[PDB]
Design a protein around this ligand. Sequence first.
Ligand SMILES: CCOP(=O)(O)OC[C@H](O)CO
Lengths: 65, 49
Amino acid sequence: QDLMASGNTTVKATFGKDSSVVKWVVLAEVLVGAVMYMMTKNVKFLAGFAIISVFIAVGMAVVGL
Amino acid sequence: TKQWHYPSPYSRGALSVTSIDQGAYKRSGSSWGRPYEEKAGFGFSLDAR
Ligand SMILES: CCOP(=O)(O)OC[C@H](O)CO
């Protein structure tokens, strides 16, 4: 038989690549990384401009329904 | 008694199951890568009771 835990495709369309999660995680870096030049003012927080698309691909393509 | 023997209740019954148907479913696818393939487981057996 089937299962009762899924069968609605609700969490897949909400927490996925083609949803709204990828938009709320791309603006959080510029909200704090682009304003920390007051006290620090050093080239340090620049290694996060490429790991955003990588972390979302190594976690969503694990199962894939 | 000494004229006619009264009947007594009696029952049996049997629930037999043949083949199974298982279915296938598965187918395939795967993714993762590888593987797946387708075978048917799926068989799914049934109880005879
Ligand atoms: C050089 C790129 O930035 P980081 O690797 O964060 O530098 C480590 C030290 O804080 C240098 O001051």
